[PDB]
Amino acid sequence: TSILSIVYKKDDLIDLSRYGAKINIGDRVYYDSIDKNQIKLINLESSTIEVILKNAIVYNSMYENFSTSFWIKIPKYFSKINLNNEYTIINCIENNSGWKVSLNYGEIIWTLQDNKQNIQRVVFKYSQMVNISDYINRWIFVTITNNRLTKSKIYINGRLIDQKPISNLGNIHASNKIMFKLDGCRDPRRYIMIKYFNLFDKELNEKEIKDLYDSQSNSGILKDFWGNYLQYDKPYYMLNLFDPNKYVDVNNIGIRGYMYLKGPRGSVVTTNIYLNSTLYEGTKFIIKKYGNEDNIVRNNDRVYINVVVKNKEYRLATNASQAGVEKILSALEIPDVGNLSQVVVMKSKDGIRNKCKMNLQDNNGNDIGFIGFHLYDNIAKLVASNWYTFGCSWEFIPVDDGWGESS
């Protein structure tokens, strides 16, 4: 039922739908080199994507149901200038009728307007005053459904967030043009990233929404914290979802030492704007290829884990012959790893997005178990354990300008 479906192909954005919308791209639109479907719009007049729909499919009805889906990534709002500044990002208003998506500090907004200037708005609000956010500077799946007899609904990552009655709106006559552009944003530093914009000529149901989410999410490729492809040879700060206010540290190099979780994390703060845990804390992990893998970490890939201590790499490993169910993990000199267990199988696991698991194996093909932690009196030591289902879920956090913390 897709009447517009925008994808990157052959050095261009095209409509895959049978309606072949014309797409005009301004000279200040940018693409991620790792994934050209990830479009970046910045706060300049020529950072524009203009989609011209065929007359045939322009929305002009009291009764026709319709839906939109897209993924968005919204950098953290840093300053008072971002408060109280609703800005359009996707505009389909003509002569004060149609629809639009807009943003504000902590908000995604859907606006419907009929030809008598009755309006209805549905809103997703997310806080920047949280230790760890599912939303800030992370890919979010947005779905908005419109049943002209009942309600407008906004879904985030397949979950219903807000719904409002719209049966009081009359004829909505939207534009033949969809303008992707930051419109009315007073912060010249603002940008968004967007991908997989779709229009549908029905009210999508919860099952169709979940299937779209799961499909476009692509559980075959692991994700970093921000929702980008997880990569080999890229340093990552580590987050244990069960103990999110702790960071990984090393208690000495070698088999007689251990890795462990230490807390609390620091805070990054601008009064009244954000108050978050520091993400750039603790010993970084680097994922190493075990094989003929390409640059992206895929579900069930076999890897080594390198740990960075004072700008030197060591190997995550254990002696699985150590008595006990929990096998305490150490940072080994790479030349000394010998016969220690070190091969890891990376697994995707997609509530909170971007969860990864790591399954340790010995050199004889035996599972030692998922990597998590175990409390030994006051110290949360990293372990591999067949006991693993809480404490064995991890996120990998690279430095990102959309998060803005100091290195």
Numbering used by the authors: 876 to 1165, 1168 to 1227, 1230 to 1267, 1277 to 1295
Article sentences:
Botulinum neurotoxins (BoNT) are a group of clostridial toxins that cause the potentially fatal neuroparalytic disease botulism. BoNTs are composed of three domains—a cell-binding domain, a translocation domain, and a catalytic domain. For BoNT/A, the HC/A binds to both a ganglioside (e.g., GD1a) and synaptic vesicle protein 2 (SV2C) at the nerve terminals of the neuromuscular junction. In this paper, we present the crystal structures of the botulinum neurotoxin A2 cell binding domain, both alone and in complex with its receptor ganglioside GD1a at 1.63 and 2.10 Å, respectively.
